[PDB]
Symmetry: D2
Subunit: 291 residues, 4 copies
């Protein structure tokens, strides 16, 4: 597998004119010290959408180079344009990424037949492991377990980041694909049930603020200490849910700033939280002893 | 708790004109022998909707009396009319039931405020444990975790049969209620993730055909043999899903008849499966060595 | 057709021990004077669920007898038990009802195949026109346009009360069934678009409080005065939406009492509105010059 | 208004390596001759996602220049990145577009607060009419009627292309915004009900194959010939639905090629239809006398 445990979907800290590389370096070092198992750079939580192609490439390369092989680095390389996804994926491979996080098409969408073609086209272009990212609440498109079954024997297609929230579906993926498709939770409030179904970790928002707890939750469960893992899930659940009270990464970035991490502002169309939601987030941060 | 492990939502076998008590007796003995942990009588799977009040009472009393305290018996006593729910619940208590399975209102529905009033009205009338039954895909109404939190301190409200299929919701219920509200899965394809979140069993359709396997799945997980448990979940998943290819209990009664159990016909508005779906069911019964 | 225009889904006014027949008579007379085109008695808005069989029969008969053929009377006779729906439908026919409003099964549900059997079984039992009532948000079950196509050549099946809210679906019903299935809106906020697709009226909640406006909206549109009709729809929309801010008939009954109509209290599991929602309803009542 | 009636969301015909400007020219002339009221270039149906920035610009400019003010031209200029949306919108304005079709963010999404900031940022940069495009089934994000009410007083925000398929929502937009926000249907199977609620036209897929019929449908309704209009809606409904049997523009390009229009192939991740769906499409094209 690319990694097991907690993979942080790291934020991209911005200055008001670009990427705050000094801050990103600090976060990298902190994650390594905090037992984060992998870094996913330029995922959704990283605001790739609102970065230029040059910012994306510089940020991905920065993370790769700073991590310096200490943990795996996975880059978000997919888009809703297949040619573009191929080119970005080739690029990331060429500069030493350990894995590619490749979203389904979104907005334009496609059929299940088209999903097979899309993923096969990206895979055929590379020799690096691919994590399919299924997030229908954002993309409008659900890749089915049957379609995943058609893709999981592909040499490079090793895993899925399953953010559907549909636990039935995740059971079906495991039943059909087995070890041919590792499952990462794509929802922090669903780590335990997904690990219970044979998942191997999480690609996490929550790990941006409590990386060691997320790592520990996974490690405990995977080591059979299931009750101890569950306690972390439940004790962190209200905070976790507060991190989705508005579109991620609005809350997590807000939270990190509340925690004195100085990670800068969001890029439009993302923006500051409303008053009520900010107060819920503060409450849960305080209750978890984070501020 | 009322029980732990596998509670079969037992079918009601019908003759042409009434309930087949002889067949019900056989099923009851078979469950006991097969290590079923509890029987839920006149639940949805029991076709209580299409039974007269006298048929319901006779069936519930028959199960209670036949079981003779060997394992817990829980009766479906709720409906969408609060007065009727009270009366039926008091009746079941009076003839020695161990627990009451009390659905939310359905079709008429109500507000979350109304749900608290409904369940408190029922509870205040009895001194028997109540399992709230949440199944929004059937009722049109979801009882929320916040509403459950308002009810879980009630003396009699001890559990929920959670059939929403929303694993995030189930985590939230556990986080809010803890030990004050036991969770039973109401979906057989979700046993493992629900137990992983601290559920204590299942009220099961699947147990009508493979009672020992469902009991073992739960026992193994609850005893820490989580991988062993998961294997049973995944190996039985395609059959499980087949049992919902049409409205339950259409497939399970069909399956039991294919297994030569002679459990009679469904009552309208339930009816025979279509050709393609029957085929799928047959395929999965054969693949699981049941016919 | 049974009727065109506005059919009120009349409330059932209750005393604290039964049905307020004196009040129901007053409402009947008021509807006749207010140009209501039909009365639907013991529909969902009439709280049939929480009435006894004897109350239902007495109420249905009362309305039939008091109306005395001045406008059509349609009774809610369907349930989720086919035998029960047959018996009630036969009964209503025997005492001179003009039409039967027959809901899909709910909660127990069934397949599309089973829906055909259910409706055919009820139809075969009677010689009175039937309005199929599709309300999936309450029943958990949507009867499809294809299934309606299979039923619309049945002698007695004349119409559908379409409360899905799915305008695409309603277009498909008209395209497939034509004049063989009249369409009544089952949502007051959708009268205009449904009439525009060839619907012939509404079975209305709103008509309980503004019967002449609902009648006029329909009559205008059906007479080609489409802009004048639309103005009534839009001017009443905020009030209409307030009447669904909680489960109907909680708001409409509350509204009628706010309007000094003395229609009594709701039966559990229905209950009084919460404070915020009550204030929204009051606001819209006042803005429409009703209180 | 920018236009009334039928605005074709024109396909972009591709050669193997670029845009087929010769074919686009032919389509443009054919639309003008067929009484199409406006052309929307590089909308969803135009496969803007899979076009380079230079291809988009050249195509939009080509349509503008070719049309030469004969009918209004509207360009798709929005994306999920606010800065990019601003830039593209200013560009289109600079080369003489008549209107801007500006989608909500998608995939990244944002809050309702963010939506107001996004659309105000775009509007503040231009002096050209803006049509907001709401399509939650593709974007994951619904702009609410209340949010639209906050935007509709903006000088440039003059319309919405409403593709939610939620007819209740569309009534609410009209009630709140009135003349300050023109409504175009974004779904061809919903033209009649949307016009009935005071919409002024459609931004249409169907118009790619039957432009004159779509224009006539709108004209007839808007001129009060509502039954005549409805007939066209219902007669074309099965074809309309066939055009969405797979992700648009898969079916419409397929259809245009079946009609011997030689409009080239789809760009990945879009692809060829499956067998069964092709068959359905063929059936409906033949039934409508198109092939």
């Amino acid at each position: 597998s690319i990694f097991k445990g907690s993979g942080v979907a790291i934020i991209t800290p911005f200055t008001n004119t670009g990427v705050d590389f000094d801050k990103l370096s600090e976060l990298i070092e902190w994650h390594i010290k905090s037992k984060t198992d992998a870094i996913i750079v330029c995922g959704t939580t990283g605001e790739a959408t609102t970065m230029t192609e040059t910012e994306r490439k510089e940020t991905i390369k920065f993370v790769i180079d700073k991590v310096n092989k200490r943990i795996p680095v996975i880059a978000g390389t997919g888009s809703n344009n297949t040619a573009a996804s191929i080119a970005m994926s080739k690029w990331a491979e060429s500069i030493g990424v350990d894995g590619l996080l490749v979203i389904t098409p979104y907005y334009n969408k496609t059929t299940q037949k088209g999903l097979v073609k899309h993923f096969k086209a990206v895979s055929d272009a590379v020799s690096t492991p691919i994590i399919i990212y299924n997030v229908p609440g954002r993309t409008g498109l659900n890749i089915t377990p049957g379609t995943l079954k058609e893709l999981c024997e592909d040499k490079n297609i090793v895993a899925v980041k399953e953010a559907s929230g549909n636990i039935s579906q995740i059971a079906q993926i495991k039943a059909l694909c087995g070890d041919k498709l590792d499952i990462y939770s794509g929802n922090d409030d669903q780590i335990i049930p997904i690990l219970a179904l044979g998942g191997i970790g999480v690609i996490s928002v929550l790990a941006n603020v409590i990386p060691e707890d997320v790592h520990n939750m996974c490690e405990l469960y995977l080591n059979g200490k299931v009750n101890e893992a569950l306690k972390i899930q439940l004790d962190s659940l209200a905070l976790t849910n507060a991190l989705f009270i508005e579109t991620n990464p609005i809350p997590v970035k807000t939270a990190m700033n509340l925690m004195n991490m100085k990670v800068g502002d969001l890029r439009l169309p993302l923006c500051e939280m409303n008053e009520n939601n900010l107060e819920i987030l503060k409450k849960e941060l305080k209750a978890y002893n984070l501020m």
